[PDB]
Coordinates of C-alpha atoms in Angstrom, one line a residue:
Chain A
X1 CA 8.6 23.9 24.8
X2 CA 9.4 27.0 21.6
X3 CA 6.1 25.4 19.3
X4 CA 3.7 27.3 17.1
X5 CA 2.4 25.6 14.6
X6 CA 2.0 21.7 15.9
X7 CA 2.0 18.8 13.5
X8 CA -1.4 17.5 12.4
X9 CA -0.1 14.0 11.0
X10 CA 3.3 11.8 11.1
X11 CA 3.9 9.0 8.9
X12 CA 6.0 6.5 11.1
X13 CA 8.1 4.5 8.8
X14 CA 9.6 1.7 9.8
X15 CA 13.5 -0.1 9.5
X16 CA 15.1 -2.8 10.8
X17 CA 18.6 -4.3 11.0
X18 CA 19.7 -7.8 11.8
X19 CA 22.7 -8.9 13.0
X20 CA 23.1 -12.5 13.9
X21 CA 24.8 -14.4 17.0
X22 CA 26.3 -17.1 14.3
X23 CA 27.9 -15.6 10.7
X24 CA 26.4 -17.1 8.0
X25 CA 26.3 -16.9 4.0
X26 CA 22.6 -15.8 3.7
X27 CA 22.9 -13.7 5.6
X28 CA 23.5 -10.7 3.0
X29 CA 24.4 -6.9 4.5
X30 CA 23.2 -4.1 3.6
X31 CA 18.7 -5.0 3.6
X32 CA 17.0 -1.6 2.8
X33 CA 13.5 -2.9 4.5
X34 CA 11.8 0.2 5.3
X35 CA 8.7 0.5 4.3
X36 CA 5.0 3.0 5.5
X37 CA 4.0 1.3 8.6
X38 CA 0.6 4.0 8.6
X39 CA 0.1 7.3 9.9
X40 CA -0.5 8.7 13.0
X41 CA -1.3 12.4 15.5
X42 CA 1.2 13.6 17.9
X43 CA 0.6 11.7 20.8
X44 CA -1.1 8.5 19.0
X45 CA 0.9 4.9 19.8
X46 CA 3.1 2.6 18.9
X47 CA 4.2 -1.0 21.0
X48 CA 7.0 -2.4 21.2
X49 CA 5.2 -5.6 20.3
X50 CA 3.7 -4.1 17.4
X51 CA 7.3 -3.6 16.4
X52 CA 8.9 -6.7 16.9
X53 CA 5.8 -8.5 14.9
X54 CA 7.1 -5.7 12.0
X55 CA 10.3 -6.6 12.6
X56 CA 9.9 -10.8 12.8
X57 CA 7.7 -10.5 10.4
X58 CA 9.8 -9.1 7.3
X59 CA 13.1 -11.7 8.7
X60 CA 10.3 -14.3 7.6
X61 CA 11.3 -13.1 3.9
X62 CA 14.4 -12.0 4.1
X63 CA 16.0 -14.7 6.4
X64 CA 13.2 -17.2 6.2
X65 CA 13.9 -19.9 9.2
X66 CA 16.0 -17.5 12.1
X67 CA 13.9 -15.8 14.5
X68 CA 14.4 -12.7 16.7
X69 CA 15.8 -13.3 19.4
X70 CA 16.9 -9.7 21.2
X71 CA 16.6 -6.4 20.9
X72 CA 19.5 -4.9 20.1
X73 CA 18.2 -1.2 19.6
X74 CA 15.4 0.8 18.7
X75 CA 15.6 4.5 17.7
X76 CA 13.4 7.2 16.0
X77 CA 14.2 9.9 14.3
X78 CA 11.5 12.7 14.1
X79 CA 11.5 14.8 10.6
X80 CA 15.3 15.9 10.4
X81 CA 15.5 16.1 13.9
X82 CA 18.8 16.1 15.5
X83 CA 17.9 14.8 19.0
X84 CA 16.6 11.4 18.6
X85 CA 14.2 9.3 20.9
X86 CA 15.5 6.1 22.4
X87 CA 13.6 3.1 23.1
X88 CA 14.7 1.4 26.0
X89 CA 15.5 -2.4 23.9
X90 CA 15.6 -4.3 27.3
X91 CA 12.4 -4.3 27.9
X92 CA 9.2 -4.0 26.7
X93 CA 7.6 -0.1 26.0
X94 CA 5.0 1.9 24.0
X95 CA 6.3 5.2 21.7
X96 CA 4.0 8.1 21.3
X97 CA 4.4 9.9 18.2
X98 CA 6.7 12.8 19.1
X99 CA 5.0 16.8 19.5
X100 CA 7.0 19.1 17.0
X101 CA 6.5 21.8 14.2
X102 CA 4.6 21.0 11.2
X103 CA 6.5 19.6 8.0
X104 CA 6.3 21.6 4.8
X105 CA 8.1 21.9 1.3
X106 CA 7.5 24.0 -1.7
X107 CA 5.4 23.9 -3.9
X108 CA 7.0 23.8 -7.4
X109 CA 4.5 25.9 -9.2
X110 CA 4.2 28.5 -6.4
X111 CA 6.9 29.1 -4.7
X112 CA 5.0 29.1 -1.6
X113 CA 5.3 27.2 1.5
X114 CA 2.7 24.3 1.6
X115 CA 2.3 21.4 4.1
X116 CA 3.1 18.6 3.8
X117 CA 3.0 15.0 6.5
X118 CA 5.9 15.1 8.9
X119 CA 7.5 11.8 9.3
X120 CA 9.2 9.5 11.7
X121 CA 11.6 7.3 11.5
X122 CA 12.1 4.3 13.9
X123 CA 15.0 1.6 13.4
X124 CA 15.0 -1.6 15.6
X125 CA 18.6 -4.2 15.5
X126 CA 17.7 -7.9 16.2
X127 CA 20.6 -10.9 17.4
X128 CA 19.2 -14.0 15.5
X129 CA 19.9 -17.3 15.2
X130 CA 20.0 -19.0 12.8
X131 CA 17.1 -20.8 13.1
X132 CA 18.1 -25.1 13.4
Chain B
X1 CA 32.8 -5.8 9.6
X2 CA 35.4 -5.6 6.8
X3 CA 33.4 -4.4 3.6
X4 CA 32.0 -8.0 1.8
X5 CA 31.3 -6.5 -1.0
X6 CA 31.7 -2.6 -1.4
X7 CA 28.4 -1.0 -2.7
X8 CA 29.4 0.6 -5.6
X9 CA 27.3 4.0 -6.0
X10 CA 25.7 6.3 -3.2
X11 CA 23.5 8.8 -3.7
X12 CA 24.2 11.7 -1.4
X13 CA 21.7 13.8 -1.0
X14 CA 21.6 17.8 0.8
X15 CA 19.7 19.7 2.9
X16 CA 20.2 23.1 5.3
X17 CA 18.9 25.3 7.1
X18 CA 19.1 28.5 8.1
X19 CA 18.9 30.8 11.5
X20 CA 18.4 34.0 11.4
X21 CA 20.4 36.2 14.1
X22 CA 17.3 37.6 15.0
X23 CA 14.2 36.4 15.3
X24 CA 12.2 36.7 11.9
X25 CA 8.8 34.9 11.0
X26 CA 10.3 34.6 7.8
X27 CA 11.5 31.5 9.0
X28 CA 9.1 28.8 9.3
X29 CA 10.0 25.7 10.8
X30 CA 9.3 22.5 9.4
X31 CA 10.9 23.2 6.3
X32 CA 11.4 19.7 4.3
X33 CA 14.0 20.3 0.7
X34 CA 16.4 17.4 0.1
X35 CA 17.7 17.4 -3.5
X36 CA 19.6 15.4 -4.7
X37 CA 23.5 16.9 -4.5
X38 CA 24.8 14.2 -6.7
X39 CA 25.7 10.5 -7.5
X40 CA 29.7 10.0 -5.9
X41 CA 31.2 6.5 -5.1
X42 CA 33.2 5.3 -2.8
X43 CA 36.2 7.4 -1.5
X44 CA 34.7 9.9 -3.8
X45 CA 34.9 14.1 -1.6
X46 CA 33.2 17.1 -1.3
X47 CA 34.2 20.5 0.2
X48 CA 33.1 22.1 2.6
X49 CA 32.9 25.0 -0.1
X50 CA 30.8 23.7 -2.4
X51 CA 28.4 23.1 0.3
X52 CA 28.5 26.1 1.1
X53 CA 27.8 27.3 -2.6
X54 CA 24.4 24.7 -2.3
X55 CA 23.7 26.2 0.6
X56 CA 24.3 29.7 -0.1
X57 CA 22.8 29.3 -3.6
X58 CA 19.4 28.0 -1.7
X59 CA 19.1 30.6 0.5
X60 CA 19.0 33.7 -2.7
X61 CA 16.0 31.6 -3.5
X62 CA 14.2 30.6 -0.2
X63 CA 16.1 33.9 2.4
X64 CA 17.5 36.7 -0.4
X65 CA 18.3 39.3 1.9
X66 CA 20.0 37.7 3.7
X67 CA 24.0 36.3 4.3
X68 CA 25.5 33.5 5.3
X69 CA 27.3 33.5 8.6
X70 CA 28.5 30.8 10.8
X71 CA 28.0 26.9 10.5
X72 CA 26.1 26.1 12.7
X73 CA 27.0 22.3 12.0
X74 CA 27.0 19.3 9.3
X75 CA 25.9 15.7 10.3
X76 CA 25.8 12.6 7.9
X77 CA 23.4 10.0 7.9
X78 CA 24.4 6.5 5.9
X79 CA 21.8 4.4 4.6
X80 CA 20.3 4.1 8.4
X81 CA 23.0 3.0 9.9
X82 CA 23.1 4.2 13.5
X83 CA 25.2 6.0 13.4
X84 CA 25.7 9.8 11.9
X85 CA 29.3 11.8 11.4
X86 CA 29.4 15.2 12.4
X87 CA 31.7 17.4 10.2
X88 CA 34.5 19.5 11.3
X89 CA 33.4 22.6 12.8
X90 CA 35.1 26.2 12.7
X91 CA 37.3 25.3 9.2
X92 CA 36.8 24.4 5.4
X93 CA 36.5 20.7 5.2
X94 CA 35.6 17.4 2.9
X95 CA 33.6 14.8 3.1
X96 CA 35.3 11.8 1.6
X97 CA 31.9 9.4 0.9
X98 CA 31.7 6.6 3.3
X99 CA 33.3 2.5 2.7
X100 CA 29.6 0.7 3.4
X101 CA 28.1 -3.5 1.9
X102 CA 26.1 -2.8 -0.9
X103 CA 22.4 -1.7 -0.5
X104 CA 19.9 -4.8 -2.1
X105 CA 16.4 -4.2 -1.6
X106 CA 13.5 -6.8 -2.4
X107 CA 11.2 -9.1 -4.8
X108 CA 7.5 -8.5 -3.2
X109 CA 6.6 -10.5 -6.3
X110 CA 9.7 -12.9 -6.7
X111 CA 11.3 -12.7 -2.9
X112 CA 15.0 -12.6 -4.2
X113 CA 17.5 -9.9 -3.9
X114 CA 17.7 -6.9 -5.5
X115 CA 20.7 -4.3 -5.0
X116 CA 19.6 -0.4 -4.8
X117 CA 21.6 2.4 -5.0
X118 CA 22.8 3.6 -1.3
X119 CA 22.2 6.9 -0.5
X120 CA 24.2 9.8 2.3
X121 CA 22.4 12.6 3.4
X122 CA 24.6 16.2 4.1
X123 CA 22.5 18.3 6.4
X124 CA 23.6 21.8 6.9
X125 CA 22.8 24.4 10.0
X126 CA 23.7 28.0 9.3
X127 CA 23.3 30.8 11.0
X128 CA 22.0 34.5 8.9
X129 CA 22.7 37.8 8.8
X130 CA 19.4 40.3 7.1
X131 CA 21.1 41.7 4.8
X132 CA 21.6 45.7 6.7
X133 CA 21.2 45.0 10.5
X134 CA 25.5 43.7 12.6
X135 CA 25.3 41.9 16.3
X136 CA 28.2 44.2 16.7
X137 CA 29.9 44.1 13.5
Chain C
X1 CA 52.0 22.7 10.0
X2 CA 55.2 21.3 11.2
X3 CA 56.1 21.9 15.1
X4 CA 59.1 23.5 16.0
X5 CA 58.8 23.2 20.2
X6 CA 55.7 20.6 21.0
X7 CA 54.4 21.0 24.0
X8 CA 55.3 18.6 26.9
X9 CA 52.3 18.5 29.3
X10 CA 48.8 20.3 28.4
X11 CA 45.8 20.2 31.0
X12 CA 42.1 18.8 30.3
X13 CA 39.3 21.2 32.1
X14 CA 35.5 19.5 31.6
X15 CA 32.9 21.8 31.8
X16 CA 29.3 20.2 31.2
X17 CA 26.2 21.3 30.8
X18 CA 22.3 19.5 30.8
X19 CA 19.0 19.6 29.3
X20 CA 16.3 17.6 30.2
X21 CA 13.4 16.6 27.7
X22 CA 11.3 18.2 29.8
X23 CA 11.1 21.4 30.6
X24 CA 12.0 22.6 34.4
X25 CA 12.9 25.8 36.0
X26 CA 15.6 24.5 38.8
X27 CA 17.8 24.4 35.8
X28 CA 19.0 27.7 35.8
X29 CA 21.0 28.7 32.2
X30 CA 24.3 30.2 33.3
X31 CA 25.7 27.8 34.9
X32 CA 29.4 27.4 35.3
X33 CA 31.3 24.3 36.2
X34 CA 34.9 24.1 35.3
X35 CA 36.8 21.3 37.0
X36 CA 40.5 19.6 35.6
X37 CA 40.1 16.3 34.3
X38 CA 43.9 15.9 34.4
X39 CA 47.3 16.7 33.0
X40 CA 48.7 14.5 29.6
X41 CA 50.6 14.8 27.2
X42 CA 50.5 15.0 24.0
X43 CA 49.2 11.7 22.2
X44 CA 47.3 11.0 25.1
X45 CA 43.8 9.3 25.7
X46 CA 40.8 10.9 27.0
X47 CA 37.7 8.0 26.5
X48 CA 33.8 9.1 26.0
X49 CA 33.1 6.5 28.1
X50 CA 35.7 8.3 31.3
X51 CA 33.6 11.6 29.7
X52 CA 29.9 10.7 30.9
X53 CA 31.9 9.2 34.6
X54 CA 32.9 13.0 34.9
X55 CA 29.3 14.2 33.7
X56 CA 27.6 11.9 35.4
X57 CA 28.6 12.7 39.3
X58 CA 28.1 15.7 38.1
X59 CA 24.9 16.0 37.4
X60 CA 24.5 13.4 40.7
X61 CA 25.5 16.0 42.9
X62 CA 24.2 19.5 40.9
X63 CA 20.7 17.8 39.7
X64 CA 20.1 14.6 41.5
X65 CA 16.6 12.9 39.7
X66 CA 18.8 12.7 37.2
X67 CA 19.6 10.7 34.8
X68 CA 21.6 11.1 31.7
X69 CA 19.9 10.8 28.1
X70 CA 21.5 11.8 25.4
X71 CA 24.9 13.5 24.4
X72 CA 24.1 16.4 23.0
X73 CA 28.0 17.2 21.1
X74 CA 31.9 16.8 23.0
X75 CA 33.0 19.8 22.0
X76 CA 37.4 21.0 22.3
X77 CA 38.8 24.5 22.4
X78 CA 43.1 23.9 22.4
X79 CA 44.9 26.7 24.2
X80 CA 43.5 30.4 22.5
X81 CA 42.9 28.3 19.0
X82 CA 39.8 29.8 17.0
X83 CA 39.2 25.9 15.1
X84 CA 37.7 24.1 17.8
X85 CA 36.7 19.9 17.9
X86 CA 34.2 18.3 17.9
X87 CA 34.1 14.3 19.0
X88 CA 32.2 12.0 17.1
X89 CA 28.7 11.7 17.9
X90 CA 26.5 8.5 18.5
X91 CA 29.2 6.4 19.4
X92 CA 31.5 6.1 22.0
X93 CA 35.2 7.6 21.2
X94 CA 38.5 8.1 22.4
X95 CA 40.4 11.6 22.2
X96 CA 44.0 12.1 21.1
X97 CA 45.5 15.4 22.6
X98 CA 46.0 17.5 19.9
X99 CA 50.0 18.4 19.0
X100 CA 50.2 22.0 19.8
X101 CA 52.8 24.0 20.3
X102 CA 54.5 24.3 24.0
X103 CA 52.5 26.8 25.7
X104 CA 54.5 30.2 27.5
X105 CA 54.1 32.5 29.2
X106 CA 56.1 36.0 30.8
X107 CA 55.7 35.3 34.8
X108 CA 54.9 38.9 35.4
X109 CA 56.3 38.6 38.6
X110 CA 59.3 36.9 37.9
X111 CA 60.2 39.4 35.1
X112 CA 61.3 35.8 33.1
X113 CA 59.9 33.4 30.5
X114 CA 58.8 30.5 31.6
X115 CA 56.7 28.0 30.3
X116 CA 53.5 26.6 31.2
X117 CA 51.3 24.5 30.8
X118 CA 48.6 24.0 27.4
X119 CA 45.0 23.8 27.8
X120 CA 42.3 21.6 26.0
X121 CA 38.6 22.5 27.5
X122 CA 36.4 19.7 27.2
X123 CA 32.9 20.8 26.6
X124 CA 30.0 18.8 27.2
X125 CA 26.2 18.7 26.8
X126 CA 23.6 16.5 27.4
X127 CA 20.1 15.8 27.0
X128 CA 18.4 14.7 30.8
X129 CA 16.0 13.0 31.9
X130 CA 13.5 13.6 35.0
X131 CA 14.6 9.9 37.2
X132 CA 10.9 8.4 37.0
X133 CA 9.8 9.5 33.7
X134 CA 9.8 8.1 30.4
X135 CA 11.2 10.0 27.6
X136 CA 8.8 9.4 24.6
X137 CA 9.1 5.4 25.5
Chain D
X1 CA 16.8 34.7 23.3
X2 CA 13.9 34.9 26.1
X3 CA 16.8 36.4 28.7
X4 CA 15.3 36.6 32.3
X5 CA 17.8 36.6 34.6
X6 CA 20.5 39.0 32.5
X7 CA 23.6 39.5 33.1
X8 CA 25.5 42.4 35.2
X9 CA 29.1 42.5 34.6
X10 CA 30.9 40.6 31.6
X11 CA 35.2 40.6 31.9
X12 CA 35.7 41.3 28.7
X13 CA 39.0 38.8 27.7
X14 CA 41.5 39.8 25.2
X15 CA 44.3 37.3 23.3
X16 CA 45.6 37.5 20.2
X17 CA 48.3 35.2 18.0
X18 CA 50.6 36.2 16.1
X19 CA 51.9 34.6 12.6
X20 CA 54.6 36.5 10.8
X21 CA 54.1 37.5 7.4
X22 CA 57.5 35.4 6.3
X23 CA 57.5 31.8 7.4
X24 CA 60.6 32.8 10.2
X25 CA 61.9 30.4 12.1
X26 CA 62.4 32.4 15.1
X27 CA 59.4 33.8 16.1
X28 CA 58.7 31.7 19.5
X29 CA 54.5 30.5 18.5
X30 CA 53.2 29.3 21.6
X31 CA 52.5 32.2 23.6
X32 CA 49.4 32.7 26.4
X33 CA 48.9 36.2 26.1
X34 CA 44.9 36.7 27.1
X35 CA 44.6 40.0 29.4
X36 CA 41.7 41.1 31.3
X37 CA 40.9 44.1 29.0
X38 CA 37.8 45.6 30.9
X39 CA 34.9 44.5 32.4
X40 CA 31.2 45.6 30.7
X41 CA 27.7 46.6 30.8
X42 CA 25.4 44.8 27.8
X43 CA 25.6 47.5 25.5
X44 CA 28.7 48.6 26.5
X45 CA 31.0 48.8 23.1
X46 CA 34.8 48.2 22.5
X47 CA 36.4 49.4 18.7
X48 CA 38.7 47.4 16.1
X49 CA 40.7 50.7 17.3
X50 CA 41.3 49.7 20.7
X51 CA 42.1 45.8 19.8
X52 CA 44.4 47.1 17.2
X53 CA 46.3 48.8 20.4
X54 CA 45.6 46.1 22.6
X55 CA 47.5 44.3 20.0
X56 CA 50.0 46.3 18.8
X57 CA 51.5 46.5 22.4
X58 CA 50.6 42.9 23.8
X59 CA 53.5 42.0 20.6
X60 CA 56.1 45.0 21.6
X61 CA 56.1 43.3 25.0
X62 CA 56.3 39.5 23.5
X63 CA 57.5 39.7 20.1
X64 CA 59.2 43.2 19.6
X65 CA 60.9 44.2 16.3
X66 CA 57.8 42.8 14.6
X67 CA 54.8 45.4 13.7
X68 CA 50.8 44.0 13.3
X69 CA 50.5 43.9 9.0
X70 CA 46.6 42.4 8.4
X71 CA 44.0 41.7 10.5
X72 CA 43.0 38.0 9.5
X73 CA 40.1 37.2 12.1
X74 CA 38.6 39.1 15.4
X75 CA 36.1 36.4 16.8
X76 CA 34.3 36.6 20.1
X77 CA 33.2 33.7 22.3
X78 CA 30.8 34.3 25.1
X79 CA 30.8 31.8 28.0
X80 CA 30.9 28.6 27.2
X81 CA 28.5 29.2 24.2
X82 CA 28.8 26.9 21.1
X83 CA 28.0 30.0 18.6
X84 CA 30.7 32.7 18.2
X85 CA 30.3 36.9 17.4
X86 CA 32.7 36.3 13.9
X87 CA 34.0 40.2 14.0
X88 CA 34.6 41.7 10.7
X89 CA 37.9 42.0 9.3
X90 CA 38.7 44.1 6.7
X91 CA 36.7 46.8 7.7
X92 CA 36.6 48.8 11.4
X93 CA 34.0 48.0 13.5
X94 CA 32.7 48.2 16.8
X95 CA 31.7 45.7 19.2
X96 CA 29.0 45.5 21.5
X97 CA 28.4 43.6 24.8
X98 CA 26.4 40.6 23.8
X99 CA 23.3 40.2 25.6
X100 CA 23.0 36.9 27.9
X101 CA 21.9 35.0 30.6
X102 CA 23.6 35.9 34.1
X103 CA 26.5 33.5 35.1
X104 CA 26.6 31.3 38.3
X105 CA 28.1 28.3 39.7
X106 CA 28.2 26.4 42.9
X107 CA 29.8 27.5 45.5
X108 CA 32.1 24.6 46.9
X109 CA 32.2 26.0 50.9
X110 CA 27.8 26.6 51.0
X111 CA 26.5 24.4 48.0
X112 CA 24.9 27.1 47.1
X113 CA 24.5 29.0 43.7
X114 CA 26.8 32.2 43.8
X115 CA 26.4 35.1 40.6
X116 CA 29.8 35.6 39.3
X117 CA 31.0 37.9 36.5
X118 CA 30.4 36.2 33.1
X119 CA 32.9 36.3 30.3
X120 CA 33.4 37.0 27.0
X121 CA 36.7 35.8 25.2
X122 CA 37.8 38.3 21.9
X123 CA 40.3 36.7 19.7
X124 CA 42.0 38.1 17.7
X125 CA 44.7 36.5 14.9
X126 CA 47.0 38.9 12.9
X127 CA 50.2 38.5 10.7
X128 CA 53.6 40.5 12.0
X129 CA 56.7 42.0 9.9
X130 CA 59.9 42.0 11.2
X131 CA 61.2 45.3 10.8
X132 CA 64.0 45.4 9.0

């Protein structure tokens, strides 16, 4: 891996899509629920159990009653990179923060390159059943 | 999935990345610089000649001395939609703001629904040439 | 750009390249593996699932101990034309043999101008995983 | 470009597409004229003057009665790579066979790797004129 400056910290953000296997009304599509999970270092871990708990928590306040049934998909988008990390959506797993080049952005006042936290976006899709 | 409630507005974000034909230390990997390009409505278009202008003006301030040489890729990500769309490869094209459901947030105070704008991230990669040099030209 | 003499048949060539998610020497760069998938008429379809099957079968015979992990790119070059077609990126797709002008030569030996089959070359890049290890997952 | 095993030889191929200036209906498009121009070593050259000659010449054998008017584009495709060399069309130039990794293919009867010449495809487009 032609890696020069290795990233220092990665902000891990979360987002989940809920699709019911029983069409209803309260299920308004287009929900933006992106939250900052935690800030981690390369190598650090994130479990599939944590992610679900997060997905379940969210659901508790975005679509009361319903309960997450089966995991549809789990993808990790790393700093606008094209290649993404595909997590096994059909068995428990553990995600390790991927190594990468340190991110940075232009300092508006100076015009020089300044370091900033790297980003990871974990997008999950779960199938839910209207709690009956 | 027939768009029930069509999205009202979509803020199109733009980000480019330039790769020199010859390894140049000046090009630091990991630059994050996104900018609102324009808030369009569904069906609204955006030509590649325009995206090029946007990339060109950015090359003028970040990498003076280089010329845009060849477009590598143009990929659009829509509001966390898992499917991204790669635009045409070797010719001019035009992007049509993809139809989608209106984005809605939440209330950490109340717990009710609350509409917010949609996002389209147009990400482009080009190859640049240092003014002067030439691969085989 | 109306077509004067539509192409009757087009030979669909297939080529794939594999990139392991983790550094490996066995993956000698410069590999050339072009096979005739099939001969179709304009309008015929070629699905991605069918392309993946070709790629998987070729992986199993050139780099067993690896599985396909993610499709990088699907590009089609049509009869020496400069504009290539990139197929969809993260989703299944169906490519329709692009409509074009009947190909023809000047059959050196015979002396006469004979119609020959047109050509589509579908080149694909896939990221592969050494059967036995988790990428990040 | 970490060029470990550098290519030994490059079959430089040439193909030219003609579009008549004045929309002509009797001009049969769809002609395939790819011809092996040469076998070269990295660094070897080919000039636009030479490419123009191959073009004019192929034009006289295929669409006799037409003359080259303007050079619209000169592109170079290297062994199936995505990145292509875009030659300057409004000025004379000279092409140098690009450095690259050795091309090989799996020999069907032995199951072993064999070195084969790498390939360059130089594609050109020209506007042609109908004589008289």
